[PDB]
Design a protein around this ligand. Sequence first.
Ligand SMILES: [Mn+2]
Ligand SMILES: [Mn+2]
Lengths: 293, 294
Amino acid sequence: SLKYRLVTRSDFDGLVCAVLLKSIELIDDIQFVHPKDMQDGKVPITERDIITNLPYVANAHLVFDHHHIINPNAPSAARVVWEHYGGTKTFPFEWVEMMEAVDKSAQFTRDEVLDSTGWNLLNFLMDARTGLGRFHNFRISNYNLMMALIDHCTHASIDEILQLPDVKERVELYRKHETLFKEQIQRCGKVYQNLVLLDLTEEETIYAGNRFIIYALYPQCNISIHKMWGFQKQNIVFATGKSIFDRSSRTNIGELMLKYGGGGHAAAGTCQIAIEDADRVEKALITQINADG
Amino acid sequence: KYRLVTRSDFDGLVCAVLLKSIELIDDIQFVHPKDMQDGKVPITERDIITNLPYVANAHLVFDHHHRPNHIINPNAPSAARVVWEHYGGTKTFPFEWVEMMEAVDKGDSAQFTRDEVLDSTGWNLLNFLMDARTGLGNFRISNYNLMMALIDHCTHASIDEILQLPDVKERVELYRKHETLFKEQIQRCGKVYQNLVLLDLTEEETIYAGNRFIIYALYPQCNISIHKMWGFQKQNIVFATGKSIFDRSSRTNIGELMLKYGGGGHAAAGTCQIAIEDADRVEKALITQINADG
Ligand SMILES: [Mn+2]
Ligand SMILES: [Mn+2]
């Protein structure tokens, strides 16, 4: 009879964790929190709490992490939960594809992220960074959809899940926007050797699309720059990222962005440039990135 | 006849109406100042430019910002007003268009009352509908082509009739619903710190379209605002700071304040992008300094 409250991050790893713990009748409550709120001590944690994918708290019932049951060679916290409770000894065979999807450190194929299907599609359309929620108010909120998906994934297949009204509404918008985003990219993307530059600053609309589309469409580039309007078109934002499909870029992006008052880490960064300087800085970025290879 | 090169804003629309009404133009091209400045726009002697940086080869250049083809009045509140006065005012143009002209003269100076920017009507509504910074743009027709239907219609229909055109009415309905949700989230997510309102939108799933003066109209006791928002793909945090158009008393030089954090702007508006791990420190530092400035 005794059940626990899941405390986790609002992401695909957290959804899958909740699906697994709910399926074995182990949780009856869930609470999505920000990692730094956990680190700062704003989330009260009791011995009736299960924590996944968050920093360790001593008085919790169980803590699953992957960066107290920890496997740092597991690609996700869900995988730790999976293997800890038996895997397919405990869970339906159909969920191996769920586990495959949650485990993707970004080990996707280019094909997988173009016109995505199954669990990958569910993952991308729920991810805040895909931007579905920026671009539309749906029938119900993404928070309330995540909540409802937990129990429905316990007794429905992925193809049925994708047919649910509140999901299929998001699927249709995701499909429409992806098509328009890809034609936008074909109109606005310019290749410079190893770098694809996507100049959006002359487009009326930007479209939602998952964050791997641009890399999948230029498999010969190992780095991208998005050139975009900043807030209320007051300045120009350059966002630079390395390709998950060609990981060979020698640019340290964080250090490069630093020269222009921005930041980031080795594989991703941004900077913000005044309008009268943006052409000069674009040429300089391109020159430097081409020199790096 | 000539080609008009202008911005896709209300000023540009009114300029096209005036020049079309005296049979001076038969094509139009919408561009942003940065493309003119960067030399990306082919300008020829068949072109009339309004409300854009001067480019040398044009037939005429109408400007109101602080040689013989350059018709500049740095004290005019819009380039449409320069056009209006250059071609003779109410002799040349219907005297009934003075209302349209009154509305277009409010834009760059943002000389609005609080009640004009909330639940807007008439020409003010059209202005905010067409302002890219309102954020409205998946409609039947692009904002480009709507601007074209609007140029013709403004030459012969009334503002009330125009707001009932199907392609306009569909934008109006969206604007009204988004403004309702915007005002709700601005009032629930804003926190006043003496002269400043800080609008923390980082936990909203959706940021709704609204004209850029609503926030100041909901916090009339504040002379300055900060929007705290997610940057690109939630990779960092954006702070966008702006002075109020209703209480113009803020003593902060915003552009110089943002410069310390790798951003910039001018005295009255600016932004910066901050690492997630630095956002709490920079938020408090911005508030402290703005509060010390008054
Ligand atoms: Mn993790
Ligand atoms: Mn102007």
